Design a binder for this molecule. Structure first.
Ligand SMILES: CC(C)=CCC/C(C)=C/COP(=O)(O)OP(=O)(O)O
Ligand SMILES: [Mg+2]
Length: 297
């Protein structure tokens, strides 16, 4: 019992330190309402992972971006959904905003099979303009084609064709503080399929050569489709975060983020998100960088 007590206190502080390391590196003052997210993270006592990320827009650095991934092996997905939504309601109460839950509600419908969930995450992207701040949720589903159909319908034309359903597992939800909400569909290709002729025909031939080059360093490729996106966002799951500079031509702001994270006590892998047009340039100006740490008893 005493071992569990010590460990619970240790993991609580480690999670807060990971959040604070990120915040303190990039934002001299924490963006409100970060402490509410910190309270939520604290309240999750089982095994989890945290994502800390930066969104670079030329010299603009957006860094109050965090996600918690529920990773307790009990697979209690409905419990985790309700914990996340409790946090969302707490945000509504403290900040004095009303969130638009309609895309999530329609996706879940009235008979959601939680045994088909493989990933659930919840978090924040906080801004100095309240209206531009958002809460975030992602749900990954497996063998649930009914829900893929619904997500594509909810996309309002963003999720291009029905051939993409073959590639979709993760569904994302953004909930802006102004009551605007968005859905995102992520079409993915796993590393084991990169060299298959079917993938060259359905996927690779519709991309320029520059979009294919980082695949060499990636375990997974994805494209994020949403009407909130100006362009489709290409995502690369780099096996080793040290390979970022070898495959992506970074501007000064992104290099700053890269440099900070090289020697932090974090997981080896990362995600990189960028528009197709950025990879055609001599230097990327718009990029998202996502880093990870796990917390296990
Ligand atoms: C297996 C797959 C498809 C994983 C997706 C990983 C990832 C970095 C998603 C971006 O999340 P987001 O769209 O919520 O972030 P942003 O706030 O940058 O739009
Ligand atoms: Mg997105």
């Amino acid at each position: 019992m005493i071992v569990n007590v010590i460990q619970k206190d240790r993991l609580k502080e480690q999670k807060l330190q990971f959040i604070r390391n990120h915040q303190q590196a990039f934002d001299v003052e924490p963006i409100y309402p970060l402490p509410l997210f910190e309270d939520f993270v604290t309240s999750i006592e089982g095994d989890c992972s945290l994502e800390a990320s930066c969104k670079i827009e030329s010299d603009k650095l957006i860094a109050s971006r965090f996600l918690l991934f529920f990773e307790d092996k009990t697979q209690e997905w409905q419990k985790y959904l309700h914990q996340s939504l409790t946090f969302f309601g707490l945000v509504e109460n403290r900040v004095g905003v009303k969130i638009n839950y309609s895309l999530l509600q329609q996706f879940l419908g009235s008979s959601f099979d939680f045994s088909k969930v493989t990933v659930l995450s919840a978090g924040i992207d906080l801004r100095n303009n309240l209206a531009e701040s958002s809460l975030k949720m992602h749900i990954r589903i497996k063998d649930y084609p009914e829900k893929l159909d619904k997500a594509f319908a909810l996309s309002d034309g963003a999720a291009d064709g029905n051939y993409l359903k073959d590639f979709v597992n993760l569904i994302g939800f953004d909930f802006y503080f102004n009551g605007k909400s968005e859905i995102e569909i992520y079409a993915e290709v796993q590393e084991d399929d990169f060299f298959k002729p079917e993938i060259n025909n359905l996927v690779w031939q519709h991309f320029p050569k520059t979009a294919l080059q980082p695949l060499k360093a990636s375990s997974l490729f994805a494209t994020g489709l949403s009407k909130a996106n100006n362009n489709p966002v290409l995502y690369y799951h780099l096996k080793n975060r040290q390979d970022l500079t070898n495959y992506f031509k970074l501007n000064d702001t992104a290099q700053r983020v890269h440099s900070f994270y090289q020697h932090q006590d974090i997981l080896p892998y990362m995600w990189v998100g960028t528009a197709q047009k950025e990879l055609e340039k001599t230097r990327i100006e718009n990029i998202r960088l996502y880093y990870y740490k796990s917390f296990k008893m």
